[PDB]
Design a protein around this ligand. Structure first.
Ligand SMILES: *[C@@H]1O[C@H](CO)[C@@H](O[C@H]2O[C@H](CO)[C@@H](O[C@@H]3O[C@H](CO)[C@@H](O)[C@H](O)[C@@H]3O)[C@H](O)[C@H]2NC(C)=O)[C@H](O)[C@H]1NC(C)=O
Length: 361
């Protein structure tokens, strides 16, 4: 079983303990570690942060302690403009440019593959996205003729029914990608004035219309569409989403007024790291959607939807039972990586739990 773990570049700048660098990563924790977001310049892959080539080095040294550990570089991301991605893949000329540029870049900095994080192809991009994948892989196959281990190619894919249908030819790209990461944690929030859980595993028979907004559907649909289980990787949250309540109500459907107040370390309205939540939990009221199988907490006028050890194990067994290829954890740097926020003296508690379940039968 695979355990893909993303690490984000900008997490280095959080203050105090919040600060996280590649060397804080347990080299045996995950099987695949993904350095988050490389940039594109003049149609060539390139660095982003001022010290990337240094962090690259840091991250890839872990490979000296664990020879089996594989690393990848993800392109795109949220601060990368989809349009941008669009422009590059639309023209065979700029596309080939970008592609030819990749292999050397990765060989140079020591990465074992490329992760495409084109954040949401449009109805008009579906045909190009497929192209970009074919040719990219075709190139990776050609570069392997030089006696080195073939480069890996993967992609983070939305788990949103409409999004999927609108921009992905899942049956095609699945044959060319080594694995696909399902962003199964973006089901709510997305600015809709009512409290709700972003990563529910299940259907929850109550108040519906969505029905498609849970990991289960997502997984099932993907399967239906043609993507093999042995290439699917389910996404697992290591952060929670917060909301500022507009009334004293707390149950399902509760009126919301906007995102939650920022955390002392991540400082971004609407998000919390698990380690911030661990601190938030002191003096709060914890609840759990039985049908969906995920927590949520409240304190004052703040409402939080998050994933805990159990929920995570839950989802992990789930993916095992459907026989998928593995789990994907968004934000090793959002987990309690110091192991000094969530109590039970343990480093990477959430990520660790997934591993434990995956190591089980
Ligand atoms: C990720 O790569 C991007 C593409 O190379 C790069 O984007 C930018 O490229 C230049 C370099 O700064 C920008 O320059 C400006 O825009 C106008 C002219 O177009 C000037 O008048 C102005 O003075 C300024 O120099 C481009 O605007 C911008 N281009 C695009 C298409 O985004 C990014 O800098 C890079 N991001 C990071 C974080 O490194």
């Amino acid at each position: 079983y695979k355990l893909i773990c993303y690490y984000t570049s900008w997490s280095q700048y959080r203050e105090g303990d919040g600060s996280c660098f590649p060397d804080a990563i347990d080299p045996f924790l995950c099987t695949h570690v993904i350095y988050s977001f490389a940039n594109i310049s003049n149609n060539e892959i390139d660095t982003w942060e001022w010290n990337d080539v240094t962090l690259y080095d840091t991250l890839n040294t872990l490979k000296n302690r664990n020879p089996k550990l594989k690393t990848l570089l993800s392109v795109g991301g949220w601060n990368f403009g989809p349009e941008r991605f669009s422009a590059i893949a639309s023209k065979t000329q700029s596309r080939r440019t970008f592609i030819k540029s990749v292999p050397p870049f990765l060989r140079t900095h020591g990465f074992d593959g490329l992760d495409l994080a084109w954040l949401y192809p449009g109805r008009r991009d579906k045909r190009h996205l497929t192209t970009l994948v074919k040719e990219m892989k075709a190139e990776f196959i050609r570069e392997a003729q030089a006696g080195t281990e073939q480069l890996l190619l993967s992609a983070a894919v939305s788990a949103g029914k409409i999004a999927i249908d609108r921009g992905y030819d899942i049956a095609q790209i699945s044959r060319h990608l080594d694995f696909i990461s399902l962003l199964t944690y973006d089901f709510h929030g997305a600015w809709r004035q009512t409290v709700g859980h972003h990563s529910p595993l299940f259907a929850g028979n109550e108040d519906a219309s969505s029905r498609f907004s849970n990991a289960d559907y997502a997984v099932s649909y993907m399967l239906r569409l043609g993507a093999p289980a042995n290439k699917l990787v389910m996404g697992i949250p290591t952060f929670g989403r917060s909301f500022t309540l507009a009334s004293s109500k707390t149950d399902v459907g509760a009126p919301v007024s906007g995102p939650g107040v920022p955390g002392r370390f991540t400082k971004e309205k609407g998000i919390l790291a698990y380690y911030e939540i661990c601190d938030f939990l002191h003096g709060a009221t914890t609840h759990r959607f039985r049908d969906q199988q995920v927590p949520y907490a409240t304190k004052g006028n703040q409402w939080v939807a998050y994933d805990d050890q159990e929920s995570v194990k839950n989802k992990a067994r789930y993916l095992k039972n459907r026989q998928l290829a593995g789990a994907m954890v968004w934000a090793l740097d959002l987990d309690d990586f110091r192991g000094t926020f969530c109590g039970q003296n343990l480093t990477f508690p959430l990520t660790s739990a997934v591993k434990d379940v995956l190591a089980e039968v």
